């Protein structure tokens, strides 16, 4: 069970040629955006929201 993604906790960064950069594991969030008033750091000199190589027919 050896992977710092499979033990959902510590940080992992991802860089690519064609795809946007990702960060981290777990760590609260998702159950922190249901108890609302969490607008989040949005767009102040920032990357693409969501990532898109998930295109369909």
């Amino acid at each position: 069970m050896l992977s710092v993604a499979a033990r959902s906790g510590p940080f992992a960064p991802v860089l690519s040629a064609t795809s946007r950069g990702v960060a981290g594991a777990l760590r609260p969030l998702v159950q922190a955006a249901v108890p609302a008033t969490s607008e989040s750091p949005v767009l102040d000199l920032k990357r693409s929201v969501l990532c898109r190589e998930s295109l369909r027919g």
């Binding site: 069970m1 050896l2 710092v4 960064p13 860089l15 690519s16 795809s19 609260p28 159950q31």
Partner: protein, 423 residues
């Protein structure tokens, strides 16, 4: 009737390199070269070198120019990705089946023949500041940087992002140095999905026979403890409380992983009270405002950090922390039912299986298994591992956290946030 699934091929070569493949008959293909070269192998003289390195994956190689790597991979519609963790770098390459060859070649050039040209490195330095700025807009990134800088006096103290004072200071020689002494056979694994074992073994035998650097996976994490505090203003407070736990692979770590599900990881139901999450229920009892709490579990080659992470309003911070902490205390005191653990087992087991169901998560697991263990351990026995964890071990994991020298990072308005001292 689907196809009868193939079996994973595994091989340790005499030189220490590991090859693992699975012909999954997928329309696409995935190859990952995993290297023991993460942030931990940086020293106090070359911090951030493995960040710029991670950023350098399409600079010029012997055998393929910058422009070729880009246009070549884009022409066939594949990807070249690089994922660093504190222990590993992982160069991943995706494409359609028919195109494995060109991407493999590119892979080998990026990892074994990087030229690091003076002016190309110069032009890429500013990407460190953007890359760092884009990650650091999650309050969690700085908290986990700081958590590590405080926990360890050592190697795991290093952050996956480059310290500001280093931006534009990382030399072309530092990267050459990092590659020659970390990207070596005995520190490497070549994992292939939608590829054949002879082909991987061939390229391994031909192109990946490098050795002339460091040896130890344990240059050695000296756990220390203490706390880092960052006044922020920032809407709500982020705090992680943690003690040293167990090195990945050991039996103890599996107890910690179960403890994490007894207390609570992320949610399972979209917008829910998280009923089975014992940490969430405990804080909720006396906190009647927006908050979050999860068990945090980090496992490494020679150390580990277990505890919890909290998101709360500035003024509720100390209540949220103290409530979470006392909830752990009750499990150390013995207050844990058999079905409580049974559910945590099921939450973990299911979660693990789901974690490897796609080819991206599969390849990463086979990769990290190859480096940490030098083995592939099938899901069937990972589930057997988990099952062997008794209630008394989970209790013993909680006992270790409570009584162990803490580490804490926190950021926001820290006015009502406690100090270890006061926990």
């Amino acid at each position: 009737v689907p196809p009868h699934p193939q079996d994973l091929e595994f091989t340790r070569l005499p030189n220490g390199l590991v090859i693992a493949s699975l012909e999954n008959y997928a329309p696409a293909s995935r190859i990952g070269l995993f290297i023991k070269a993460g942030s931990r192998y940086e020293n106090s003289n070359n911090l951030g070198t493995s960040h710029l390195l991670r950023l350098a994956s399409s600079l010029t190689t012997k055998g393929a120019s910058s422009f070729k790597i880009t246009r070549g991979i884009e022409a066939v519609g594949g990807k070249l990705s690089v994922t660093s963790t504190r222990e590993n770098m992982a160069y991943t390459v995706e494409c359609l089946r028919d195109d494995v060859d060109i991407l493999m070649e590119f892979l080998l050039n990026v990892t074994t023949a990087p030229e690091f040209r003076r002016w190309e490195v110069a032009a890429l330095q500013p990407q460190l500041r953007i890359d760092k700025a884009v990650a650091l807009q999650n309050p969690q990134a700085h908290v986990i940087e700081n958590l590590h800088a405080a926990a360890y006096r050592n190697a795991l103290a290093n952050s996956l992002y480059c310290p500001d004072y280093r931006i534009g200071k990382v030399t072309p020689v530092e990267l050459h140095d990092y590659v020659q002494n970390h990207f070596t056979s005995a520190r490497m694994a070549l994992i292939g999905l939608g590829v054949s074992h002879p082909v991987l073994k061939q390229v391994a035998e031909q192109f990946l026979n490098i050795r002339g650097g460091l040896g130890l996976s344990g240059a050695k994490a000296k756990y220390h403890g203490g706390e880092i505090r960052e006044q922020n203003g920032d809407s709500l407070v982020h705090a992680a409380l943690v003690a040293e736990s167990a090195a990945i692979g050991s039996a103890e770590a599996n107890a910690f992983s179960v403890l994490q599900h007894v207390l609570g990881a992320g949610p399972h139901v979209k917008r829910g009270s998280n009923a089975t999450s014992s940490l969430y229920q405990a804080v909720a009892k006396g906190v009647h405002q927006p908050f979050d709490v999860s068990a945090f579990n980090a496992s490494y080659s020679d150390s580990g950090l277990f505890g919890f992470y909290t998101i709360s309003q500035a003024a509720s911070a100390g209540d949220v922390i103290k409530a979470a902490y006392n909830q752990v205390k009750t499990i150390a005191q013995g207050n844990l039912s058999n079905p409580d653990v049974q559910a945590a087992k099921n939450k973990l087991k299911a979660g693990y299986l789901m974690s490897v169901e796609s080819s991206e998560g599969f390849l990463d697991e086979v990769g990290s298994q190859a480096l940490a263990a030098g083995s592939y351990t099938p899901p069937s026995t990972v589930l057997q591992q988990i099952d062997a964890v008794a209630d008394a071990d989970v209790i013993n994991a909680a006992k270790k956290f409570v009584s162990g020298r803490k580490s804490m990072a926190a950021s926001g308005n820290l006015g009502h946030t406690p100090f270890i001292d006061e926990l």
